[PDB]
RNA sequence: CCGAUAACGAACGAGACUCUGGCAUGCUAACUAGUUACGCGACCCCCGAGCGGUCGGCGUCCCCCAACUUCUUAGAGGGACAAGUGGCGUUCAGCCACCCGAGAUUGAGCAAUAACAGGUCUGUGAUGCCCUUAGAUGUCCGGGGCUGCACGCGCGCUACACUGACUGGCUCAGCGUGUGCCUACCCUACGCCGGCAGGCGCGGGUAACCCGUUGAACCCCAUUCGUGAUGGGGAUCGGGGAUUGCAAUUAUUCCCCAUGAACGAGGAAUUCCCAGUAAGUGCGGGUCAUAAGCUUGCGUUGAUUAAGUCCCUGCCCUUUGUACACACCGCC
């Protein structure tokens, strides 16, 4: 029933966020489906072309 | 980052390019050597900053008309402007599109009924003027 | 052909998850005899990912002021702890360290200071580089806390910390802290 | 160096003035 | 800085500049610097090497009786410019990445207009006014004080231990000081005595010549200890011995043997910091007859995190509002 942990690869970096620069928003496409892609805010040093894991499918989508 | 060149180097580079464009070239290590004798530069750092900007500006000049003047580009302009005069004028067209409203004006000036004039059909609809405001 | 600390070839180690393959540096050109190759790894962003992971462990293990420049002692400690983990498990200490890092690195966290909503504020994902950094930091902190006021040696406590993290037994300080962080991130979703 | 210093201002660049040296004539060769 | 332009032409500041660090087996040189090579040696191997291995042992500017400058010293120069390539950008100013390269942001110094009732009259034979000027607020001498303690605060040092302490062995620096106008007081090798602090003789050095090849600490390798207020910590305190000085009591400092107190990582708060940096760790200089828990420098080991933001604290530019202009610690 619960959604399994999946993987998403960063394609683009959408700039910092978090009121202190401590997060960066990145557009990530799921390794399962190349077409399906969302935007998520992540912490730590991120560069385009790296894979990060997701414990949930949807959390957030906004443009600053 | 932090590689902005100031007035002291930019004006000097422009002046020496204007004066010695022929001697100057695309080689940084040769422009730094010609800068030894074409001008008195107190500091080696100043002289090679100037030489680097000179090479950059010459790369720009070889393609386009930079604000720094050059006698070859100036004479090329002075050629293009006074030349490419067409063998036949664009003002000796055999037929001329003339609106009937414009046709009556020549009648008073008794220069109408010329062969080169062709009385057209004026547009009907008066559909000029853009729609007002938004949309 | 390299045999870090004279033994335990590096080429036999396989990285488990795709997310940390580019950031865990154990194989091929990341094959050095010693975890002491000071080479200006902080001069640019994303350069410590090219630093071999044993050297990162060594750098993180010398902390709390009393031993800050003593990197030779830390190299010795890592060498011994590798001997103990090989003795206990029978498998490659580098593989054990890699698996411990994979299992210790948290996958989610919390952030934002918006009046401290529920636990911290709003849940956030973590980058692979921060996963590796926090895993190494948690392992070193767990070993240090385990070996502070007791007879067990730093090498032994580092060994058991890495072993428990690699097997995921939740008997390790790093695993417990990671679980707590994931729990509060879930609450701050 | 009597009425003052000898070194120029460090940011002062003085560019010498060349001559014409155009020479648009036909290629000849002086014999001497 | 590029550009737009009722502005044009300038001046200061920034930058540029000076010193320092990084590279030059390229040049100039070196008995107050060395390296190689050779000759004497000393020790090991000797089966058998022998152009064998070690020597901070002696020599070859003790002038005819070797060369060279890599190491060291320091001068002249060179070298790096966003210069080359790719992308972004008006394709402008520039930005990002990469190659080659020692180096693609090394640190400092200097530093505008205007101002503060900021600090110094206890730096000055800088100084206006005022006070005092012989029972002196001048100056000198003796003694005491500047240290004095129910308490609060700031800069620090040592620690709370086993990533440790003790004992022994081994092993590596760079800054820089050194015999005094007055002015008396230098750095110290070596030998002897003592357990130590020290003492007693002999030198050397006004200095790349002597200390000194600065045998530094940490670190490294072996020993003992075993999670305890314990061999952690060394506060407090007794007794004894030296050194400086005219004088050591309110202990100047140092040495030895005893005492082993709090302290088991510290609340609210809060400081500093981005690469040879923080930190650990010693060594110089200043003060110094005697002296560093201070400061100014130097080396040694040497990281975690970050290449962002305006959230807090502030700063700069523009617009805006103002009843403020002693300028929001305002005004009312
Ligand atoms: Mg003891």
The candidate with the shortest Cα–Cα distance to C189, out of C89, C99, C117, C136, is: C117
Q: How far apart are CA C108 and CA C123, in angstroms?
A: 7
Residues of A in CB contact (< 8 Å) with C are: 5, 7, 18-20, 22-23, 31, 40-47, 50-56, 59
Q: Which residues of A touch C108 (CB under 8 A)?
A: 55
The candidate with the shortest Cα–Cα distance to C56, out of C24, C79, C33, is: C24
| Residue A14 host element (H or E) | strand A6-17
Touch of D by C (3+ CB pairs closer than 8 Å): no
Q: How far apart are CA A17 and CA A23, in angstroms?
A: 5
Ligand 1 centroid to residue D4 C-alpha, Å: 75
User: Do C82 and C93 form a contact (C-beta atoms < 8 A)?
Assistant: yes
**Residue carrying structure tokens 């401290």:** C116
CATH assignment of the domain containing B36: 1.10.60.20
Domain count, chain A: 1
Could you write out the DSSP letters of every residue in B23-89?
T--S-HHHHHHHHHHHEE-S-HHHHHHHHHHHHHHHHHHTTS--SS--HHHHHHHHHHHH----SS-
* Residue B51 contacts strand E, CB under 7 A: yes
The candidate with the shortest Cα–Cα distance to C52, out of C78, C19, C70, C77, is: C78
Among C17, C22, C130, the residue with its CB nearest the CB of A43 is: C130
Q: Which residues of A touch C128 (CB under 8 A)?
A: 44, 50-52
* Residue C116 contacts strand E, CB under 7 A: no
CA of D29: how far to CAs of B104, C86, D20, D22, D32, in Å? 73, 90, 20, 17, 10
Give the residue numbers spanning the domain of B41. Answer: 2-62
Give the residue numbers spanning the domain of A13. Answer: 1-64
Experimental method: cryo-EM
User: Do C185 and A5 form a contact (C-beta atoms < 8 A)?
Assistant: no
Q: How far apart are CA C54 and CA C36, in angstroms?
A: 9
Read off the tokens for B29.
Answer: 């290590």
Q: Which residues of D touch B40 (CB under 8 A)?
A: 8, 13-14, 16
Q: How far apart are CA C128 and CA A26, in angstroms?
A: 13
**Are the beta carbons of B12 and D18 separated by less than 8 Å?**
no
């Amino acid at each position: 029933r619960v959604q399994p942990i999946k993987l998403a690869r960063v394609t683009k970096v959408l700039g910092r966020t978090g009121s202190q620069g401590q997060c960066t928003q990145v557009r990530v496409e799921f390794m399962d489906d190349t077409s399906r892609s969302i935007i998520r805010n992540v912490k730590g040093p991120v560069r385009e072309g790296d894979v990060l894991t997701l414990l949930e499918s949807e959390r957030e989508a906004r443009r600053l | 980052m932090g590689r902005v060149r100031t007035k002291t180097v930019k004006k000097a580079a422009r002046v020496i390019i204007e004066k010695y464009y022929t001697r100057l070239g695309n080689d940084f290590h040769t422009n730094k050597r010609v800068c030894e004798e074409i001008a008195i530069i107190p500091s080696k750092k100043l002289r090679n900053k100037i030489a680097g900007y000179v090479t950059h500006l010459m790369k720009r000049i070889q393609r386009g008309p930079v604000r720094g003047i050059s006698i070859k580009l100036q004479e090329e302009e002075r050629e293009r402007r006074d030349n490419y005069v067409p063998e036949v004028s664009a003002l000796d067209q055999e037929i001329i599109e003339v609106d009937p409203d414009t046709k009556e004006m020549l009648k008073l000036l008794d220069f109408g009924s010329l062969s080169n004039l062709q009385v057209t059909q004026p547009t009907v609809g008066m559909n000029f003027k853009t729609p007002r405001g938004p949309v | 052909d390299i045999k870090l600390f004279g033994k335990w070839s590096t080429d036999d180690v396989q990285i488990n998850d795709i997310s940390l393959q580019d950031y865990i540096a154990v194989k091929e050109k990341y094959a050095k005899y010693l975890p002491h190759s000071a080479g200006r790894y902080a001069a640019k962003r994303f350069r410590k990912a090219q630093c071999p992971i044993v050297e990162r462990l060594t750098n993180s293990m010398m902390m709390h002021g009393r031993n800050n420049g003593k990197k030779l002692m830390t190299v010795r400690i890592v060498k011994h702890a590798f001997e103990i983990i090989h003795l206990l498990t029978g498998e490659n200490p580098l593989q054990v360290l890699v698996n411990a890092i994979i299992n210790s690195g948290p996958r989610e966290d919390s952030t934002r200071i918006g009046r401290a909503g529920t636990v911290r504020r709003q849940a956030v994902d973590v980058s692979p580089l921060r996963r590796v950094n926090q895993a190494i930091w948690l392992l070193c902190t767990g070993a240090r806390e385990a070996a502070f006021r007791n007879i067990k040696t730093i090498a032994e406590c580092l060994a058991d910390e890495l072993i428990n993290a690699a097997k995921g037994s939740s008997n390790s300080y790093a695993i417990k802290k990671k679980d707590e962080l994931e729990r509060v991130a879930k609450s701050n979703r | 160096g009597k009425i003052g210093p000898k070194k120029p201002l460090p940011d002062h660049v003085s560019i010498v003035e060349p001559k014409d040296e155009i020479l648009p004539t036909t290629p000849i060769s002086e014999q001497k």
